[PDB]
Backbone:
DNA sequence: GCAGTCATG
DNA sequence: CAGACGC
């Protein structure tokens, strides 16, 4: 927890913002040796193109700003690093507009943001590896993968970079399965890893999001749900909804993934925030 | 044995 | 919209 660098930067955000929740969420998914999450602290390895280093982010609730510290190897691409922190944390969100449009759904915890990511591909590996297993299990799994294919930091030994598209699309489907996953999955990872490497997987949010999710589901191992969750956490698309998610339909007693799909049009263009809310707001119940 | 989610008709 | 693949 000592400064990892001499440069510090300041990112403003619009209140309200539940940082305690945000960090909780990230800490449950923290890939061991890649990220370190504490009380009001978040660190991780980071590669921006060819540059390498470490970010820490520390929230300052009273001044409503986020404090960012960069390792020296990341200084030349600080502007881009901050952009990743902004998308990781959903800092450009206008909560009044969102919670206004969520009405009653937003009232209980207005400081809910959309937990994003730093690298679209990285989220990709996660969205897959997170399939069919507890948040916690995915984390241990992702730890074993990273440790194997991750690239260590020259100046922060204790830290390792999330595996690149390069070293991962070259992974042996058999070495993957051993870390503790079906073979079919090991291939999805490799197929994804290859998409990124040509350019078939969009690294930023596409213009027609709805049409790019279509394209995604063709990928092996990637169904409607995984493609959705990925657009959300991966492209930080704010108008996305999981009518077929189980925990959701558990709140819509006896309804079709179409009876719901339409109910959630009353929350356009902020369906993603609607989704997040219903999930982490247990006391909520729909309008009959 | 029960679900969850990724596949085809 | 209506079969095959870890608790």
Residues:
């Amino acid at each position: 927890m000592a400064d990892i660098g001499s440069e510090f930067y300041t990112l403003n955000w619009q209140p309200p913002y539940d940082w305690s929740w945000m960090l909780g969420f990230l800490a449950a998914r923290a890939v061991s040796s890649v990220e370190t999450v504490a009380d009001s602290y978040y660190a991780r390895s980071l590669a921006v193109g060819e540059y390498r280093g470490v970010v820490t982010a520390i929230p300052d609730i009273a001044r409503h700003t986020l404090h960012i510290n960069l390792s020296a190897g990341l200084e030349p691409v600080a502007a881009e690093c901050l952009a990743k922190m902004s998308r990781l944390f959903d800092l450009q969100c206008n909560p009044q507009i969102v919670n206004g449009a969520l009405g009653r759904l937003g009232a209980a915890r207005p400081g809910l943001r959309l937990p994003g990511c730093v690298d679209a591909f990285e989220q990709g590996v996660r969205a897959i590896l997170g399939q069919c297993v507890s948040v916690a299990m995915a984390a241990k799994l992702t730890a074993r993968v990273a440790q194997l294919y991750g690239e260590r930091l020259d100046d922060f030994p204790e830290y390792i970079c999330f595996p690149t598209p390069q070293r991962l699309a070259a992974a042996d489907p058999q070495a993957l399965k051993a870390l503790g996953m079906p073979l079919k999955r090991a291939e999805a990872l490799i197929h994804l890893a290859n998409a990124a490497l040509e350019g078939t997987l969009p690294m930023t949010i596409p213009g027609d999001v709805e049409q790019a999710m279509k394209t995604l589901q063709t990928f092996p191992g990637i169904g409607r749900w995984t493609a959705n969750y990925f657009a959300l956490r991966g492209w930080q698309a704010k108008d996305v909804f999981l009518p077929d998610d189980y925990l959701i339909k558990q709140r819509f007693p006896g309804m079709t993934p179409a009876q719901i799909r339409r109910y959630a049009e009353r929350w356009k263009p902020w369906r993603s925030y609607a989704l997040l809310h219903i999930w982490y707001t247990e006391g909520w119940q729909p309008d009959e």
